[PDB]
Design brief:
- Chains A, B, C, D: One of its GO terms (molecular function) is water channel activity.
- Chains A, B, C, D: Its main location: membrane.
- Chains A, B, C, D: Belongs to the MIP/aquaporin (TC 1.A.8) family.
- Four copies of one chain form a homotetramer.
- With about 220 residues, chain A is mostly helical.
- Chain A has one domain: Glycerol uptake facilitator protein (Up-down Bundle), CATH 1.20.1080.
- The first copy, chain A, is built from eight helices and no strands.
- In chain A, helix 1 packs antiparallel against helix 2 and helix 3 runs parallel beside helix 8.
- The longest helix of chain A is centred in the middle third of the chain and has 25 residues.
- Chains A and D meet through loops of A and loops of D.
């Protein structure tokens, strides 16, 4: 069954993306002498991991690797309802296992928050929701524009274009909200570490931005 | 009307480019303990944001995302006069809204200059004009060479080539003039923060470099 | 003979990859005042070196540049047994010469460990084996997915996709195990410097991950 | 005349490459409080500048942008003797003007060495020659392999492949010899600043590596 292979591919792609990207945010200086946070390190690891998984799994399941983008294909009627519920569950379970593996191999002195997205202390959760909405809007718009069959002027690697869209979201919003733009990426480490503060903005935010991006492209710009 | 969709696309592309790129230049250490400025952080965010917006909006409006490059298409008779005045206004308004959104979500202690381009204290404004002229000249030349229909040996992603041209301009001229090469990118935060020092070099500079680049390519090198 | 040219190409590609990548990990601050380790420096040098050698030598020998990936083509029956033993020996000898050249030109005060992969002090060798297994699994899967003739939706540079897969492995596992994912890359400097601690995990790890990746792609996902 | 346009293109491409890349190496901390040298900053600026100029000027003059690579096309009989002497002179004059412009706009307190390549104090000039030879060998081999008409499996941007080859040379050899791999890039600032120490290794080194790379590819690997 091609459907079972697509669900397995989504689960495996999420697991690798979460393990590699959340591992790169580990502060190896520890709580004693924390090292300065390398923003280029985190931004490229997240962005290129997405570009790697889309290259690896694009032709098997579509390479959504995101619950927010999965919801957008339902609002645009590109995938079925039955496919979405299995896609989202696989993404959520892949992040839980991926974060769980990272917690097992990471030394206890450098675990820290295990990459849990948090709103800045001086940032209101209302401002946090807006930041996550926009960064996901630019990501979903890029995916829709990069995968439009009617287009002809599309050049280069589609996966690399999607990855850099993720990278610029991190280069902006790491110190605002953590630059999640992926409900599964935030759900994974939150389950493992039990940090549940302002978690709803990481579901409401990316999903609203995804639906707005998909609807604008499919029904306004290129109908 | 396809014209209204092109004007809207230019406004939206500018808004995302300004918000994400100017947000990355925020010094989160504040005025108390400023952190060292990460030049790779700013350069890639600006460059890849342009590569993202050209990928997103190239087939809708042409993806100018710059008043300077818009003027070049008029001098080369690639766009009409009526299209340019609506393009420039949309770019200017998109940067104002994009910078205004950033000012709303940025904590007051880390706002700083809000990404306003400034000439170096030891740099004469005459030297500042020359620096901006050249970095815009290499950007417009790349765009013209990447979008030449008569060429055959063009390979790879056109948007990624345009983005790296922006990135190398930042890797050079951040500490000279701020590496603007975009009159709208400088006009936006200047309106919000009311910093208007040496603002004319960010219009005269990029425009002269753009016109020189477009004329040299279209009428001297590849007529 | 085309076979002799392929063996020579593998030897030369490994030599350049080892010399350039291991040179970038040299801490020029020395043992007196060590400089902070630049992770982006090491990650991109390793990743782009692979993308450079695949571009240079892909059409001559296939551009394996890795004993682990060479074993995967045998388990998938893409290369012959006789070709593999000559490929692995050339890779091992290329890394020894490449590391030997680096040791000759590097000043004695900054030689340090000469890029020998080591397990973290707080990391158990069992955890070290798991980390190396996964990072090689994502690398071999990318290579197999990027070089599948049956695929049609493959876009962009194949070599650049393979390089970024290496880069994200380094951005994750430099402080865990050294992010080897290449038995030859670890065998080379180990011979020169005589550091042989936990060396078996750099052969058992990458090979098991390579075989699992090749078998899953060729016999489960895309049979 | 197409010949005059090719010579002008080589002069202009060299001028932009030298000005932007040498500007990025300026230590803005000055001699009072020097800032730590950002290696990723210098490596990407040099590499992406080459990728930008090849994209800009590849179809006009071939985009050599290097005296060493120009000599390789003569040894391989890809260009004529008369074309080479005009190409090399344009490259040398472009670097002199490009470095001269940079010296004019750079504040006197941060000029420093103006990007002059120097051998490390603990490095023997004999070791310096070897380092420059190899990094140019991998650059010329990439150019020859990326521009082989007989090849079919070439994918992605050719200019981006050439740029990353330059970038990995810098990520290795900045602290060894300065990572010149371009006789013009070293000749330019040397004339302006009058620093002439071990200058011969920056001509003998890159040229020997270029000739070895071109001969091996054209007459041994792919005859």
């Amino acid at each position: 069954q091609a459907f079972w292979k697509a669900v397995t591919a989504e689960f495996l792609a999420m697991l690798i993306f979460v393990l590699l990207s959340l591992g790169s945010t580990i502060n190896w200086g520890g709580t004693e002498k924390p090292l300065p946070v390398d923003m280029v390190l985190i931004s490229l690891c997240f962005g290129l991991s997405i570009a790697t998984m889309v290259q690896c799994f694009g032709h098997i399941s579509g390479g959504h690797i995101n619950p927010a983008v999965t919801v957008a294909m339902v609002c645009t009627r590109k995938i079925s309802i039955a496919k979405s519920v299995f896609y989202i569950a696989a993404q959520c379970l892949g992040a839980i296992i991926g974060a769980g593996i990272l917690y097992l191999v990471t030394p206890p002195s450098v675990v820290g928050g295990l990459g849990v997205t948090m709103v800045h202390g001086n940032l209101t959760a209302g401002h946090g929701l807006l930041v996550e909405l926009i960064i996901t809007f630019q990501l979903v718009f890029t995916i829709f524009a990069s995968c439009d069959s009617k287009r002809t002027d599309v050049t280069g690697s589609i996966a690399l274009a999607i990855g850099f869209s993720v990278a610029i979201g991190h280069l902006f919003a790491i110190n605002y909200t953590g630059a999640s733009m992926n409900p599964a990426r935030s759900f994974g480490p939150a389950v493992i570490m039990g940090n549940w503060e302002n978690h709803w903005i990481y579901w409401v935010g990316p999903i609203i931005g995804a639906v707005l991006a998909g609807g604008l492209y499919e029904y306004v710009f290129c109908p």
